[PDB]
Design a protein around this ligand. Structure first.
Ligand code: VQP
Ligand code: VQP
Ligand code: VQP
Ligand code: VQP
Ligand code: CL
Ligand code: CL
Lengths: 262, 264, 271, 267
């Protein structure tokens, strides 16, 4: 049983708010993170969403998935996980002067494929893989999770740059849409930028990716990116979702080309 | 401006039994209803949801739309509307031995068509029209609103309202004017049969699967014998599985107003 | 009248849970089971399903149908039945080392035929017959019921919400086109699949991991249970009856009066 | 080369327009400016990229007929600062105002627009949304090309540029729908606006029907509606820019030279 009685967790610094609750740093046999609701009486809908999310996290035991640790129901619904140290992959790639050697970029790709392969073997669809939901714990261990937090206008836009054509169209989410999103993560790692950086108008992106043949410009991958990795990325990015590989092949392929580098 | 200064609204008894309810009877220049986010500090998303709803409500002025009256921010986020007297249409039809005359049932359908026609003219989608969201104020005026309302206003799970969801909504632009027309069609079915559809299918998952695949639709032979022919035709029109075969509310309103005149 | 006043039932151990309801073991003049809605203000479909379920159970009196005993209104809607001792046929056959002798396998088929024959004579379509809804009470009496508790879909997860019923759905129900395909005949097909579990000891399509392949191929008619898997001592009358119940064209399946007479006659023949 | 404006220097004034994520204000910074400010909580990776890419394109432009980029800010919020344009857009003048334009003025409006589009293309910049709403008539004598749109996301509870969109942009079936040639087409619709005073397909408004028929080539602008005193070389130029086959469209060096040469002939 993973319920944590009231009075044990010392809630500390507020990190941000998402669509569920508010994430804090806390103390419980060390450092933890607490995502908790604002209400003392949750609706049946909030309680269902809470049981769903505890339900999926309780099914995961893998070094590359954010470690679930427990939950509270009083005074508020709360999900307790390990505390991740460092920054998301997004901040490293796109919002800092962190320079990664290609060996480390491959290693990050390999660890992300391990976590995704694990989730899919459990028939878990992440639905929003992107470099912002990849945390580089201790600068050495990928942790896949849901790390999106708002620390005037409301954010209305989805993760359009990682959405497969069939998703950006609109059961669109599937294992194959997670694979496509992983392909865009490979693009981030291997080019150092986001796709479609010359197209400011998001409607044009939506229109061209979902209807036409707009796809990331693979000529921007760094010269030292292994050919096998470039080829794998293109497979993950196929428009027809049934031509994309599955994560057992993706993992096997990344582990094998990485060993070629050593 | 519609902001109400602190300490003007007196809050009273919460409406409902569940301790998660948000609606209270209150006093502000008379009776009011107050929908309150009871938290010590709202999140940004809660702040935005509160502003999204007030933003839609303040664009409505119509006798058949719940009257928005103001909002407050301290001590909590609170939306203030008129206080409605009486019961929802769901309670009259399904939770009480209220029996309506056909004339009264047509009048309820007509007034609900006026409010829906007004909303669509303002390009507002209700997204959850059902007999629970139709209030019979003073037993003479339909008010359309949110009267369960623990759910919806995030700019951006099938846990309820499935009986009013169009095939294309269950499938998954799912919400549209045309899905509002479908839900209105089910409301007509409630008015004209006295009952909810699919009364013999306990399993909610089989309803969901069958309705979305076009293999299940309301049994229209259950409409009562004095329901006007034109009203039955209109109902089948509003319930078409292909959303584009459904009439728009201007037509719906005109046909109800005219078939009603043929019976007073 | 079958309403049970409040405070008479001592609700005990939680036994199972879904998003809307909870099953408990209880005390009410002996042991009972209690299915109780989670909320005090249910949705319009939950309230409608409660009334229809009480109204259907109220009309059943048969040793192979779960015994309805009463229902509650306060604090929450609850339906009260007998407490069944033991495990479902599914747990016995597929999640346990129970080995049934063929005579006992025939007997379970016989008792299930009796209860379905009775339901259909009351104009009751079960709609979800499968080995999980056949309770082996006291290890000697079949109790047909419907023990599922509905769950809302999670974000992280086709026919997904029905995934526990797919192996027992007739082709027309899998196709699910145009009109309601649930009927006395689709119940019969689900009985055919139960016969397959009993007589093979396994679920159909064990060789096929792809759930989407199963659905497509069953619905089209290019896939049906492998009847070569029946056990050596399965009587010829039973394997022939199974195949009748599994016919693809629903109008070609027999009805339960003939099903029950066939099983009862063939059971007599083995002493 | 730093165009970053320290915080506290700009005085943000009247709000001019809003979209779902951003807002344009009139401001004060060594005189009058316009300030486009990202006002969204938790800006997405794509919104942050578009802010950066727009500053990088604008910083490569110095031309009297291109909206003048002046600076950008990072604190407290991301903002792009430009000159303040005085007057109204070409769209407001033609379609929502009692403005009468001499045909001389209309040729000169098309001539300056061609100058700035020729400049943009020479710098390898595809505008991607040229329309009369994006042509500002600064002080009623100087065309300023810009992009004054602010992205909007339709709300869940509620149920554009298409008139200037080239057929291949509507179809999304050919490689690279947005190109120099799709900008030439849009310019052709701006020429049609100028020489007829009305928007195209004005008497055909069936909506998604118009879109479908323009994509498949079964509906094109009615060129018979050009004003009588419209030069023949301007009407044949407009018809060339409007060609369905993108490769038959002329480039702006030729477009500008044709307008240039024809505007001398009528003083
Ligand atoms: C608290 C919390 C509870 C949760 F339940 C989820 N949920 C979730 O991961 N779901 C996806 C699950 C699966 C991948 C299996 C689909 C996320 C989080 N967030 C979280 C956790 C640790 C953190 N440490 C440091 N910092 C700076 C953070 O911001 C931080 C953080 F935001
Ligand atoms: C308080 C309140 C505040 C709100 F903001 C909304 N919102 C809303 O209607 N939105 C839909 C908008 C649109 C139709 C335009 C789509 C609803 C309510 N509810 C309410 C109002 C009055 C009531 N009077 C009596 N009684 C017994 C009630 O229970 C009651 C009640 F529950
Ligand atoms: C409480 C309850 C009330 C109900 F109304 C239904 N309904 C139902 O069978 N409907 C089908 C009717 C018809 C066949 C005619 C179609 C089911 C149940 N469940 C139940 C009953 C007894 C149990 N004894 C032991 N154990 C371990 C259990 O788990 C258990 C259990 F889960
Ligand atoms: C502030 C701002 C900043 C920008 F960065 C862009 N961007 C942009 O033009 N990009 C296209 C670039 C290229 C042509 C090279 C492709 C636009 C604007 N808007 C703006 C500027 C000035 C204004 N003066 C008066 N009035 C009434 C206005 O409304 C007004 C206005 F809205
Ligand atoms: Cl994005
Ligand atoms: Cl419902």
């Amino acid at each position: 049983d993973w319920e944590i009685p009231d009075g044990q967790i010392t809630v500390g610094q507020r990190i941000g708010s998402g669509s569920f609750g508010t994430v804090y740093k806390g103390k419980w046999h060390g450092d933890v993170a607490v995502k908790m609701l604002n209400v003392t009486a949750p609706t049946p809908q909030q309680l269902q969403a809470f049981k769903n999310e505890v339900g999926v996290l309780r099914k995961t035991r893998h070094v590359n998935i954010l470690l679930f640790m427990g939950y509270s129901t009083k005074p508020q619904l709360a999900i307790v996980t390990q505390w991740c140290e460092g920054s998301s992959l997004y901040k490293h790639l796109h919002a800092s002067e962190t320079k990664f050697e290609m060996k480390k970029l491959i290693d990050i790709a390999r660890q992300t494929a391990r976590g995704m392969d694990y989730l899919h073997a459990k028939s878990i669809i992440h639905r929003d893989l992107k470099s912002n939901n990849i945390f580089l714990h201790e600068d050495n261990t990928v942790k896949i999770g849901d790390f999106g937090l708002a620390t005037q206008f409301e954010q209305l836009s989805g993760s359009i740059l990682w959405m497969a054509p069939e998703v950006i169209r609109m059961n669109p989410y599937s294992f194959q849409s997670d694979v496509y999103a992983f392909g865009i993560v490979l693009y981030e790692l291997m080019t150092g930028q986001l796709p479609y950086s010359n197209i400011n108008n998001r409607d044009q992106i939506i229109e061209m990716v979902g209807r036409g043949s707009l796809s990331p410009d693979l000529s921007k991958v760094r010269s030292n990116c292994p050919k096998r990795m470039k080829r794998l990325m293109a497979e993950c990015l196929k428009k027809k979702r049934d031509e994309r590989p599955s994560f057992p092949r993706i993992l096997a392929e990344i582990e094998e080309l990485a060993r070629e580098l050593s």
